[PDB]
Amino acid sequence: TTALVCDNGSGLVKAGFAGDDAPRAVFPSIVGRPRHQGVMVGMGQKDSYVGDEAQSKRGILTLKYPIEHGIITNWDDMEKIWHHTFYNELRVAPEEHPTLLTEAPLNPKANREKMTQIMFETFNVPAMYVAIQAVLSLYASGRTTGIVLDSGDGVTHNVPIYEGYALPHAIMRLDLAGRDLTDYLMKILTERGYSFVTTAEREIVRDIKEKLCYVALDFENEMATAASSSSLEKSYELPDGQVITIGNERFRCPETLFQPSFIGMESAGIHETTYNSIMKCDIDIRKDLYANNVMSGGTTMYPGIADRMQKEITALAPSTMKIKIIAPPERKYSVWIGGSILASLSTFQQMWITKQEYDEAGPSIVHRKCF
Amino acid sequence: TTALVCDNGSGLVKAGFAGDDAPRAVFPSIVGRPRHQGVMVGMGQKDSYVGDEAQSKRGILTLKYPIEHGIITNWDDMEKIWHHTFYNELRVAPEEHPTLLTEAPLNPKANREKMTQIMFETFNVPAMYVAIQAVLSLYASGRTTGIVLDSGDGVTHNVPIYEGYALPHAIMRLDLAGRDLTDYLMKILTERGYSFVTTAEREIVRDIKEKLCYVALDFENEMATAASSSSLEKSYELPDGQVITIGNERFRCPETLFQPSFIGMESAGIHETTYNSIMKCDIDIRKDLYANNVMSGGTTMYPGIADRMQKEITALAPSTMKIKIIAPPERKYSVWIGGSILASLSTFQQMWITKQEYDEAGPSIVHRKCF
Amino acid sequence: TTALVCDNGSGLVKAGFAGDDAPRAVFPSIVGRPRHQGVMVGMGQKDSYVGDEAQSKRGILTLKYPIEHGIITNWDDMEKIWHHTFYNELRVAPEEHPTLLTEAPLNPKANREKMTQIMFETFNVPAMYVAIQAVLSLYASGRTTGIVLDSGDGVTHNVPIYEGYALPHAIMRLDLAGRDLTDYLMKILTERGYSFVTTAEREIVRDIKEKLCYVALDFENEMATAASSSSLEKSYELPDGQVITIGNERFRCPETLFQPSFIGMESAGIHETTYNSIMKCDIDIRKDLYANNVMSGGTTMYPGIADRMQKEITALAPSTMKIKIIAPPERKYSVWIGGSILASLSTFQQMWITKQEYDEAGPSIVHRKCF
Amino acid sequence: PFSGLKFKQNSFLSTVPSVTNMHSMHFDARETFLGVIRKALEPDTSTPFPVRRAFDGLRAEILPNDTIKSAALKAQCSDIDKHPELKAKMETLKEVITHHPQKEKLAEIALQFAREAGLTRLKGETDYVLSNVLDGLIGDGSWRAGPAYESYLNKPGVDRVITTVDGLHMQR
Ligand SMILES: Nc1ncnc2c1ncn2[C@@H]1O[C@H](COP(=O)(O)OP(=O)(O)O)[C@@H](O)[C@H]1O
Ligand SMILES: Nc1ncnc2c1ncn2[C@@H]1O[C@H](COP(=O)(O)OP(=O)(O)O)[C@@H](O)[C@H]1O
Ligand SMILES: Nc1ncnc2c1ncn2[C@@H]1O[C@H](COP(=O)(O)OP(=O)(O)O)[C@@H](O)[C@H]1O
Ligand SMILES: [Mg+2]
Ligand SMILES: [Mg+2]
Ligand SMILES: [Mg+2]
Which of A217, A248, A263 is the last residue of a domain? Predict the structure, then answer.
């Protein structure tokens, strides 16, 4: 039987079958409910919408994300998305296929215990397993050593691994990712008169951030350039036909990733965290970790971010070492791609948590068979 | 057939085919077990790394020394090391090649009895012989009279030999050797903010000691020069790119060989131990034993140690007598070379120990047949 | 004139006058600077806060510790701390009182030379003396024989003293103390959903550790006991009115002291360190050392840690020996009380490092007249 | 038959692995535990030679070091009722194990192996050679039940805790 890999990200849900190269279904992880009163009878009205269908009707809906900062909050909404994932996107029966799930490191244990119960009772899967997202990223890259920086919609974390051995005391986590940048852009866009308050408009801003933002190699010099001429200004067309023009906001939004103090956070930037993560490891493995920086996740897709990270890490590291940043073009699906490989290993088939094992031990069995 | 020589020292295992000028395999006697958690399938499945792979992967391992202060303690680790030496480095069948092992003087009898039991039971060796290391060293030197100072990583011992007649009542043994110097250097590099506490750091500090230390002719005079200027200071590159500089630690570390008071031991220095070793022999051979100081082992390789030895013994010795220090350049492998010589002399093949003899007499045969 | 004693520990500063039974000023050693942009004129006019003032206003500051693992790393902040201690807490002019400082053993030599220079130039103290913390702790116990286990916020060290004579080659030092335990408690508090990331939240976690943690006599039975019922659970109120409940985390956090492998360190626990330090002494003083374990420092007042330490040493020591742990209730100030006693002795007024003696010799004088 | 067997006090300390290595993906808790036990029962020099040898031979037969020997012993121990000599040897091993001066440390190490790495996950279906060894270290026999792990889904605390970092990116 074919295994299922379903990466419940904060922003997007990536699902597919093990052995495939790309996820079959990628839809936003939102659940929308109407906020007006219907007047026209005789047409199909549903109390809720899930996924793409919710996006197309976002002008009349209130969109809510059932996952925040990496931890699932609205379980009833979360159950709906899985049901939509298994029946409307994949057209399969979960009672026949094993499922492999993903989770950020250092999440509360209650989060993964519920993921076991909601899959062995609500959907009745034959078996399931929970894996660390950062590790799955390394599998897709075809390596066995390095330091992984996976930054998605909710959580940015680092996991240094040497020869298949991780160093848990060196794992770093930050609650600073794409959803926080979208809220920041939605704030500095009020500088030019653009206002976006509704959840429908936050989706519009999230699209603006994707298609126009980039990371400048030098912040000061770029700021002076955008303040000198109108070279950096670009135009965007709103869905109602109005046109907006932005200048220095293009590279100010992703700068928070390196200077978190913009949004009031006291933590250091990702480049310092990656350096700080390396120095917590053993002295003999720092040479390899410098040359094997692996990135994955949507927040890494900004143009020029690999160069900016390359410049910053070099300054903090000694002059002798060589810094290499690895950003494969398809890193937006690296976690899922590694998930398909891992579920397709013949050796991995002994690590599943079967239905029989769960009934003997309860939801707590997920803490022992899963890292 | 061709004979095997396997000099088991505390620090380095030197092995090779007898009748050859130089060893063929020199690898450190280190057994390593993984320390951190393993997280990736397929990587791992190796309970214990032994030999050189235990030096490559130091970042994730704990390194234990099976043969401390000469006496073997962890017999399972010693068994693993012997298995590795016979089956991987030498690539020879242990049941088709006579072997030869070495032991320091004044060791516990149980040690060599268990050595013989392992050699004749686990490995089914055809024949074997245990020889005292310094006599082998003298064999390599091509002499028949002299006093030998062998100082390796575990044990520093002396035995005066005159015309092939050893004097057991003059043998001196002192548990102060290379590993103690490395630990003392560890305790003294803290004075400059450098901290080394783990086993991989132990190997790093040992490498620093090998590559930078030297023996000062006048410790008091050299100490003034180091505190006066910076000519003595050198630089070393740590594996992770940091640069350290050490000053008076270059010659204060090897001084413990002459003043064991540095590490808190009440025993006297090696020069005075050699002097006492001669005064315990008969008056008519003292003249010859002054003129044949033969020195061997890695700890003897420090630059200038021969000259300091010569000066100290001349200070202790009578004015008329001539003090001559013999320090062949290959003295790092004098014991192995002497084993190769002794295993190839015709008059030696009647001094073996054979399984047929073992079965009749038991492990007690080793004290009766060997010295 | 009256002497001054100032124990600049890693976490707390203890100061007072010689001959007094208790410190007169005890404030945390933190220097904080604002991290938000001020808006009201005439109210935001200070640059940095010292001591209790930083704790009270920690909501809008970034708290930094000027000491890391007993070694001073930010000398300007240390100058501020000393200035505050001399002027605002004790209200004395340092130019009229000799000072006694404290330092952990095996500390970098530059650390005490700069202390001497700062005291003799910036503050112009008439004379000053540096004492090892563990030795002073033994003064305030009415004994001249025993082994001292001092464990504060940064450094845990052992110093064996027999009949007034120290055995420096048996001094053990370990970089595992209260700050590491607070960090570990912060790391494992995320298992229940409580996330603390900022420095103020670090202080909150430290207070929780101080108030709700205890050492289990038997770890595995305690883990079963807490996992079978809810008897060990306790409630703590966060400063904003929220309530947190912790379970096995009460005795898991202090357990790292005996099993340092939880936080990725390779060193052995405090009991094994004590045993190793004792076993490096002479064979005729072990019997007295087993009977005079002295424990002091803030990390030492976990409830029941004395019984656990005694049980562990009893397991490690031979049966015929008597293990006695000495833990007076005032061991948070044993070091300071001993420092007060020593400066009050009439036989100590000849070992001060006078101002004239420093000018003649330079900062190197503190190495000769001090241990 | 094994009177006067003295052992090193801390021989087995260097063998127990780190707690972090217990959760290794490929970690044989059984083999590591048996290696620790094997190190714990090493005869010292003080023991007389004949009894020392006899115990060494018994230990080699029951507690080997090679993987093939351990596997063969485990396979031949499934139907143990046809090997009364193995019964006698195991009973003799139990008698000397139960009088080990370091029994408490061995028992706590066994409990740590059971809890962290899951030494006894079959909860009564464990190997026979492990059953008698564990019975020697802990005589109550309570290890048949299990480590009695903890659970978080019973919601003893309703949580609802919003700290500084969680208060910024708050939804609804
Ligand atoms: N080309 C792009 N440029 C900048 N940001 C992007 C781009 N594509 C996606 N993103 C952002 O990445 C975020 C997270 O995407 P994803 O990798 O799916 O997160 P997760 O790992 O939580 O599934 C989204 O919120 C989106 O805004
Ligand atoms: N070039 C060198 N300079 C100084 N010390 C050395 C040198 N080479 C080896 N050593 C020391 O010699 C020790 C062991 O060398 P060796 O003679 O092989 O020991 P053994 O006699 O036990 O085999 C090592 O611990 C190392 O510190
Ligand atoms: N009752 C207590 N229980 C547990 N830990 C405590 C208690 N009181 C203080 N501590 C901890 O002891 C640590 C060090 O205190 P202290 O002895 O003042 O350190 P130092 O020796 O560096 O001055 C503090 O960081 C604090 O967290
Ligand atoms: Mg993701
Ligand atoms: Mg040698
Ligand atoms: Mg202190």
Answer: A263
